[PDB]
Design a protein around this nucleic acid. Structure first.
Ligand SMILES: [Zn+2]
Ligand SMILES: [Zn+2]
Ligand SMILES: [Zn+2]
Ligand SMILES: [Zn+2]
Lengths: 182, 193, 182, 193
DNA sequence: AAACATGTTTGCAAACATGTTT
DNA sequence: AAACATGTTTGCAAACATGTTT
């Protein structure tokens, strides 16, 4: 976590969030509203990039893509702006652009930053996760965590926040049970 | 859509399953249920028995097909996930799409029917070893019977058929196949049902 | 209603039944257990025929078949013993035979009678209704009622009972609301 | 999969909808939304306007197609129910499978593309009546946009195209079509959305 | 037009099916 | 083998979508 010059921050108000576990439990392809908050207007082009990555040191070097099944299953792909391989998708924004790093091969999705609505106090982004946290041939139940980063139009980082994502089928249950381990 | 009725044929063709050890829980068979319960990619020994020497190029084709009427017309291939997954395909020579595989036989040849598009695997028939009453063939089933994007837990059944070197069916036997994780458990539960 | 020599009778213990409305509310293609009770063993071949027919005098002469959509929609038809046109189906009985009257063209389904199980007090039959009570091109929401008849092996009637059938989507709701009209 | 982008073409081709009375609630149009809301089997008057006389056998083809990317590849036909229902077909000469119909024109010819299997209907182009600025064509939409076994409430949109007598596209305009029961209500609600 | 009839969609939890870890 | 992890199926009611009756 790096608040940066604009005191960047992410927060949450079919899914659920354990504040103190910094974990987001949510169903697949369902919509996840995510709250963005700055303290001072970021630069101009300023973008919000959401990138997935494995939590465990063992697997951090491996890119995070959708399992083969979902990747090529008309379902969810057919009529789509985004690439079928990308795990993270953003809904409700034509400007949203999906990117594959030529060198690292890492997939991510950017959305141009925009101040909140008048009176509001949050820039709300709509994220969709397109593979369960357990798809064989994909995450194979390997915990992953999202890295939402506020960057300068040319890719300079201005801030970064991160939470563990676990997209499943019973976020309620899983969260609760995951709360029992303590 | 391929036939599934038992047909002993002129050579009193027959398939059966006899347990390779004396646990060994990698698989199990309900003679009573005509069901074979077995673990994915693990090896299944299947016993072939004739009563009179079959023709010349005689072959044994094993083909998978959905049990229920609603799906019979759909081919049976390996789910997308496994058809790519590095594992089970890396040192393999067999078509990653094919469900049924035979291990321990270089002559084993995999085939996709140009018209029906149905995948199957053949092995040239060879009589038993001296003093032995069974020709044993080693099959491998490459997808759980619940792989999403594949069988999606739709019952399938194997159709092992003894055919003439030019495809004329001399004999056929069928058994339901349910490849899972706990063949022991599943069979048991299936029997308490 | 004609009890007949064997004091024939039908009763009920995804569906529901208004005793005093002689109406059966049940979802489509879902299973309906129906209780048969006699007072004295019926003849030998004795069968139980279930036939649908329109309640309203206006439409009684028109046969009752499944609407065109369902009639030829792989769904529910594909792997099936019974004809895709037949509204009423019985599940759990290989002996069940579906029949189309050559002259009247009327569809119906028979099931060989069998005494109850030991200790039991009912011969229970499993009926499936395969079209909503409202399928356009079919019942077009025209009330129909089932005529379960106990007959002699050669078609002589030994008894007959009948209840109004209304296969819908919310048997609960519909029943309740249908109970409000009074 | 047929194009849906507006293309005025050399003859400044254009389609518009002007209300036949002075209620008449049988249909309505959201110029703003590019959506036509109309009742099944009832008649929809559609205004055609060019700026320069089109070629010779020039025709006006109206073809239906699903709006959403996921279904575009699927043809648009009348649900099974209506394709048989005695009504709307009894005294009719038009293919009971076809969704779009044109009333008041003997020359109107219905067509199924042999390769794509796409159904459409053509009417030879004829200039406006003297003193009139529009060529009016009468369309009929034969299935609610919610017929199960048909559109099953999948948004569709009409592609009226002005073509040369031998199928070369000279102009094309599109509008979303939503045939229902309460065009009034639905349009209103659609606008409050 | 306003009310009513009815199939659908969405959300949710229980009982279950089935691969994985212990 | 026994326990645990997790996707599925089933049932159910609310809010809704949409044809029909009034
Ligand atoms: Zn996946
Ligand atoms: Zn698989
Ligand atoms: Zn129907
Ligand atoms: Zn229709």
């Amino acid at each position: 976590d790096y608040p940066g010059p604009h005191s960047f921050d992410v927060s949450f108000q079919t899914w659920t969030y354990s504040t103190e576990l910094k974990k987001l439990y949510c169903q697949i392809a369902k919509t996840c509203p995510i709250q963005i908050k700055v303290m001072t207007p970021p630069p101009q082009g300023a973008v919000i990039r959401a990138m997935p990555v494995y939590k465990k040191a063992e697997h951090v070097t491996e890119v995070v893509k959708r399992c083969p099944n979902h990747e090529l299953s008309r379902e969810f792909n057919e009529g789509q702006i985004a690439p079928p391989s990308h795990l993270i998708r953003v809904e409700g924004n034509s400007h949203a652009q999906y990117v594959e790093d030529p060198i690292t091969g890492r997939q991510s999705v950017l959305v141009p930053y925009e101040p909140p609505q008048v009176g509001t106090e949050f820039t709300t982004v709509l994220y969709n996760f397109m593979c369960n946290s357990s798809c064989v041939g994909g995450m194979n139940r390997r915990p992953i965590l999202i890295i939402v980063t506020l960057e300068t139009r040319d890719g300079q980082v201005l801030g970064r926040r991160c939470f563990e994502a676990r997209i499943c089928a019973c976020p309620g249950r899983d969260r609760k049970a995951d709360e029992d381990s303590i």
